[PDB]
């Protein structure tokens, strides 16, 4: 399942996605090489995702079907929820400042974790390998 540690391995069109979000050239390059690592543990319907990178180290906790607030490394705030369909996690979010929609998907492909994002007509992915 999702249990365990995962290390980012490669990105697809991630810089274009950050540009649409309004991030400048310098900060986009730093974001693309963030050394992101995720540690996931489950407890019933409750997930704890430990996020560790060159920017910060925080713990994100949520319950399926219950909305919560989340902040990006640049200060941008979001609100939304995650649900479980099939063997995938699907999340629907909204930017708190301009109100635009943002979708994310997490699924397992062999021994790799694939995370997909969609924002204002642009799609990007980040692929993690299991520790």
From Swiss-Prot:
Tissue: Expressed in the small intestine. Expression in the mucosal cells of the ileum extends from the midvillar region to the villus tips.
Pfam families: Lipocalin
One GO MF term attached to the UniProt entry: fatty acid binding
Highest rank taxon of the organism: Eukaryota
Annotated effect of mutating residue 65 to V: Large reduction in stability
Sequence positions that bind tetradecanoate: 82, 106
Main location group: cytoplasm
Record-given protein name: Fatty acid-binding protein, intestinal
Classification lineage: Eukaryota, Metazoa, Chordata, Craniata, Vertebrata
